[PDB]
Symmetry: D2
Subunit: 442 residues, 4 copies
Amino acid sequence: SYRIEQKRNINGAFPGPKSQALAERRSAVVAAGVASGVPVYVEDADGGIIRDVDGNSFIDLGSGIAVTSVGASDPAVVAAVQEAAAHFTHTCFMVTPYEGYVAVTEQLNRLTPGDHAKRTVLFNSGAEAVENAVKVARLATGRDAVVAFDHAYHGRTNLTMALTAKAMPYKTNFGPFAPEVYRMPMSYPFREENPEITGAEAAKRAITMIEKQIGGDQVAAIIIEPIQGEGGFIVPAEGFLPALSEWAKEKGIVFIADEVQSGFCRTGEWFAVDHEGVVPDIITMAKGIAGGLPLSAITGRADLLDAVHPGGLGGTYGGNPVACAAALAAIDTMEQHDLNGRARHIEELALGKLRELAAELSVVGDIRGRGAMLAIELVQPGSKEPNAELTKAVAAACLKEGVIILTCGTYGNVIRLLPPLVISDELLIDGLEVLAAAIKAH
Amino acid sequence: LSYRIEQKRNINGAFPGPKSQALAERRSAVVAAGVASGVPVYVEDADGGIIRDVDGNSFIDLGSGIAVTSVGASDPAVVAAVQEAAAHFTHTCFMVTPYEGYVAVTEQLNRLTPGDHAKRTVLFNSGAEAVENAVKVARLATGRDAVVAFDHAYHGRTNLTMALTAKAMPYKTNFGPFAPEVYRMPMSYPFREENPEITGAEAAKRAITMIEKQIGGDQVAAIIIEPIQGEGGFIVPAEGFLPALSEWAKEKGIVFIADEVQSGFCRTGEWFAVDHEGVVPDIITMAKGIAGGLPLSAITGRADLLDAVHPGGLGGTYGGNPVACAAALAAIDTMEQHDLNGRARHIEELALGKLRELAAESVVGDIRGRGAMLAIELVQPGSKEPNAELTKAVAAACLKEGVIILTCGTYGNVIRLLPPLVISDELLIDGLEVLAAAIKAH
Amino acid sequence: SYRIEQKRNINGAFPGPKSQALAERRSAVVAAGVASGVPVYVEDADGGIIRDVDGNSFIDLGSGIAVTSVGASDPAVVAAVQEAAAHFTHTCFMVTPYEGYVAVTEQLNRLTPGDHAKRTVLFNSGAEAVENAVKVARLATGRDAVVAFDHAYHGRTNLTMALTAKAMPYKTNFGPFAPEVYRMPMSYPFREENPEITGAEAAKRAITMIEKQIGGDQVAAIIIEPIQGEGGFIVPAEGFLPALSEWAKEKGIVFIADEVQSGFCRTGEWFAVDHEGVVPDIITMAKGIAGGLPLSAITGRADLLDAVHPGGLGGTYGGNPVACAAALAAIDTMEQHDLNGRARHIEELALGKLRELAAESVVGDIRGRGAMLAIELVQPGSKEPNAELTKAVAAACLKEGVIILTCGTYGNVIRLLPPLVISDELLIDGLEVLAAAIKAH
Amino acid sequence: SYRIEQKRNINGAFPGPKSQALAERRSAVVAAGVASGVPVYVEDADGGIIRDVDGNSFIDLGSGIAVTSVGASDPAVVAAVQEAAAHFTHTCFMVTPYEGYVAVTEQLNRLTPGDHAKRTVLFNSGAEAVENAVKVARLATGRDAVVAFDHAYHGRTNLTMALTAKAMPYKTNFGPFAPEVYRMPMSYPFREENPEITGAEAAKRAITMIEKQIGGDQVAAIIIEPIQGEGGFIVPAEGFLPALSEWAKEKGIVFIADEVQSGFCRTGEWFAVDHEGVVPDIITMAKGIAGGLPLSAITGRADLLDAVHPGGLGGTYGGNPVACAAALAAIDTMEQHDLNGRARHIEELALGKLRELAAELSVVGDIRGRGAMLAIELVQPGSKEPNAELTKAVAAACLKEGVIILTCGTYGNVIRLLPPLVISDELLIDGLEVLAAAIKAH
Ligand SMILES: Cc1ncc(COP(=O)(O)O)c(CNCCCC(=O)O)c1O
Ligand SMILES: Cc1ncc(COP(=O)(O)O)c(CNCCCC(=O)O)c1O
Ligand SMILES: Cc1ncc(COP(=O)(O)O)c(CNCCCC(=O)O)c1O
Ligand SMILES: Cc1ncc(COP(=O)(O)O)c(CNCCCC(=O)O)c1O
């Protein structure tokens, strides 16, 4: 049940007048480099629709980059936010604490993998979350080196840039970068030089390399996205993540899962690591956690997090009470409406339609992902060379028909589906039809 | 002015009370041990100058959440704005689907920041993110590496902002290695100058010569400084220091970044602390007071600098959140409607009055600050040696009597007044009387 | 013509009494970690022999890690050192200059590849040379990032550690390391996941990765050893180096060849890059340059090196006059006795005997050029490394009076680095002892 | 007794024809930037004379930057070199060891301060020596941070550049620099803002700053030149070095004395630390050690040096046998001819003549140093402002008269006397007369 009509509806040309008016204002005051993928301006976002200031209704297949999984306007979240704001907007937990912070931490304790003793701290952005996971790994182990992987993306602060693989646009001319970061090869099945390589073997490759080029006893943390997001929704071969987890335990290395994009029901489980039952030492979270309000978290082993001295982790806004109210509601919606189930159902629908399309075409290199985090990697016809041209084209074509869809990938050639998990089957099918049509058209 | 909850100090028996204790018990099972709070009671409502706890106790708020809730923790305008905006959409990610709130906030910041030259703005979530982004811009725009920060500086808890921060405990210990090419230079700190007669101009020459000999002016991307150093101890530089650095920075092509995260938005009696001396920074970093408690931060700077950054080079997921933007517009509106600059100047007069009366009745080393950002540096009796022990004592004493007051300083010996600017004279005086009684008592 | 008898001769058990005496003195005063691969102490080294203080004569198949290519006692070098020392040991070129420095510089200008304008600066160690190449790349280009490769070795200073791939023993617990260094995959034919990969394709793999993870216009320098030494005498597939060179030129990136181990006739050409006619923008040199005296150098494009401001490059000892005399003599000997030719002849002999051994399995790969050759040892019937056999063989060779070195990322490569003045007779004797040792284990 | 006539003799204009011929050759093949302070080319250097290729004889007041303390042509060194080279030029100690290495190490053990267990490793340059001291400190303590001082100079590798204070010409455009290096204030009496500050107080200032900005238990090493060379022959106030030493011991920090310039009799004692009886944990050496041949060393506590794993420290050329023969001879000459005594005698003569000059003038700011490591800091007439102009002038004037003298200093305004210790009284006086005349002339 929704608030605004859940149907795709484009009334004439866009951007419309009111959108154009805003663009004009924008170019006088916002930095030129801050671009938007979409030229229309939101007035309402709800269920699977973005409606613009000129009354056009677009299908939302990005959920704000995997943020509004509960929908951009979940009545529970809205209510929670409205009520909390009326009491106090901020007191800074480090100064005067409040129940919202604790309550959220209780939930994250419960929902994260593993049954061992865990603790949590809250911050605002995903970047902050990763920054804090690495601080904890470094302090708790007494070691320096952090290993990240090819195709990794972890943020836009200096260290998270360091941890991020792709240079354009995230890194160029923003260094020098935080030291003692090392990059290791990823399990990326579709582009392995030896297509027969298994996950275990891909892990052994990374491990040998870490051991020869750093030494296991020198590494503070291994940080990896269980499904790499911006890198192109790369899902590692079965057996890779457990092999890294087991080795990390053996060498005393903190294993950090970055579940900022993949966390909170997005993949059909509470966390992407749950597909393989990997139990990380620390997990970084943001995006979906608070239904669009700015909140992020790390939850990890009590012995690691409790090692940090008093006042060593924190920030001003972190664990904001309005954001916390949002999160508690958001999580509540995830449970009440079985969004894990909704995500699994989306996978079935969408992989269905996408595989039908593969069977007609050839420009479709690889279809992959889990739950509501799915992707199609587009290639040059008859080879494996990347096709970023087609990818830009298809996004634009979708936008023209009233479907907002995101792209990604190291080679710029991956279309990603990140619908809100509360999307209706009707809308999702409509979106997929538009997408399918667009690919065939170019 | 008019408030929602009774604006009187009122402590009903022992605290923490039962409901606060119940929350502390829940907390210790789920929140990291290191995340400590200065205050053992839990907020239910925060409004005007009162923090009221879950057990009905009403404390005087002399910290405004570390200079965040300048408009008050429950300004009706902010609340209304938040409530309305949340019902439309919580988040779409400005980099994907843009929205008026972002543009409007940017319009305001353009207008209110110093200088009449072309300026642009980008929005993020935390102060740390802001500083991170100011430095990215300086580095990209100038093509240089080095960034100079000062003794007693504080800029944040990400790896780079830790690098920029001077004090190691608790902000840095065991969290490195730190981002490279950061250099530290001496501050104008009148009360502790080895030559008490040194002028601001001379203090600037000292820094400048040192920068030139140890880096070289043409190698420095940015000089970053807090016009009044916050966590360092509300250190106000001698008159003539800031303009000398500004002038030299212009001469050498160095971006001059004013970190106005704590001092910005009326806190000091002007819109920005740099306005006291008419310094016009090349970039200014903002957060805290900007959005009346909601999580928002910003950089506003020369258009030619900010527009230099390539498309998609600056950003983030949550940044410039629409609910936070609504809050900011309302917060700024309240600052104008109720002349909080004026209120801040009036607070300066009242508080510096009472504090100087106390000095006249010796443990009071130095009284300093501007507006609603004031401090008393406490020393050992009859000398200049720091007195952290008395400082902790006084803060505890004040808490006991129902006044929440913050401390800071490189040497742990500074009591800081950061009341909300909407505080009543009656409450402020009560608070200052309690503070003055506490100092005399220990 | 040699000075000491060029025959292998072990008189009983070693270390002998005089060597033992020195070991005892050593353990009181030299840091415990500073270990030597050989337990006997030199008194004379000449041609292909190391003779110890107890009169034992070992075959020298390491030349001091590719340093004494002209021999550890070339009469020309000796004479030149002796004469130059009697005039002055040092004045510091940056203060009072001297002909020796200029002369050496003239030679390096001539002997290095390319006909473009080149300039040179002199230092002491290979690490210093690499450090200074990178300084020049960084200043000249105005960029930060430097790319090195898997299996690289470039030195023991903080930055050259940073550039070096292998952590044990060169890096462990010595960081944090100098920033903006990126590591890229090497062309290592024997261990490519796709055995059919060509040099051109290996280059494209590296180039795409550099471009995606740094950006070509952000890279100050690409630094590579034409034949990777400590990494295991890895020779890249044909077409790899020229591809990197061409791309570097396209993107304005300084291409640094590290010819510290491979330079000066060691591979059969003046420089290892000459095999493929690659012309580097800067080349780093040490080791063989001065017949054992401490000297190192960078020689590169005049426009790059002249970009550096006055007094930006230097050091105290650098371009020491005694070392310079030694270098002029050493280079002279390389020409007069055609050591390039001697090196090529050594390749023929040694690859011959090594391939015979492969016939009759533990021999994974035989590779190298000139007097820089290697055999990579593997577990019987697979490609798994065999460091155990490698240590064993080295020890077995030592026992029989042959000093031979090991190397490799996986600790499983026997390397031949004989002095280029070695006699066929001695070399064959050494190779027979080596072959015997491999068969024995 | 000497080999070439020990008298100043300039025969007409220079550079002469043969020198000019070499300059012409040079400019085609040596990098432009590699400049020499002297335009004539050496043929022989012996005792206190540099004789050029055109037969001119200059007084040598630099000893090759404090290298040829025994003279540039000590017969013992020459003989030793000649004999050693005939046996073998190099075998690489890590491969095939040799007596020369061990013997040198035996000497350095004996001559360095302290009676505790010590060990030594040998390298080639001073930079390499400092690099290795820091490796050891880091590996042995398991900590990262290294503190160096204002006016410090330690070398031209990336890390030793990091450690070095002055940017022109040593650092400009050569970064980014090795991380975790922190800079602390030096005891520099002549330019202290409080002229009455004691060495103990200067130490406390550094220590409090290290403690507040890094934390003692985070610092691997404190590295300092007992007399700062390139920084301007700055001699710290009495009590500074022992204070740092005592504190380092308390906090488990390796105290590294960089005696590369000041070591081996240069200051009138075997090492400059011997003036105050400071016993360093490691000491770095080069220059004088081997009478002009390239050799350098670290000698320090056995427990520190032996902590390094097998093969962790080394290099190809390091501890070269010809250089070792030179060293054993050089050290032997230092003892046989009591160069400590000669240095002390030089101090008396030179400080005498320099103080006479001070009494006539005013442009002489400060006279300082010990032994044969002495300096005069030149200032603007009647003030303390630096006088680099006069300093360059005086060096050129001295050169014109046939006296080669060096300059240095953070501010470019210090004349330094680094004569070889085997210089005759007659020659030294002649040189000082020329210098005194030059200062009076400009
Ligand atoms: C996997 C993963 N980790 C961290 C982040 C960073 O989170 P925040 O932007 O700081 O909240 C992300 C973000 N991904 C979306 C890309 C946004 C952008 O700015 O381009 C992530 O996926
Ligand atoms: C001057 C100044 N700059 C940056 C910050 C960082 O802002 P955020 O806390 O990341 O939003 C601050 C903040 N100061 C409050 C100290 C925070 C703490 O963790 O103790 C600042 O003052
Ligand atoms: C290729 C290459 N580059 C630099 C070096 C360093 O030379 P120096 O030892 O600094 O003079 C080297 C050195 N190779 C020998 C390494 C042995 C060791 O363990 O030090 C090199 O090969
Ligand atoms: C005090 C001190 N420590 C180290 C060095 C470096 O020695 P090397 O030059 O690398 O052997 C020095 C060197 N000082 C001479 C400066 C000459 C120059 O490079 O400009 C030193 O004084």
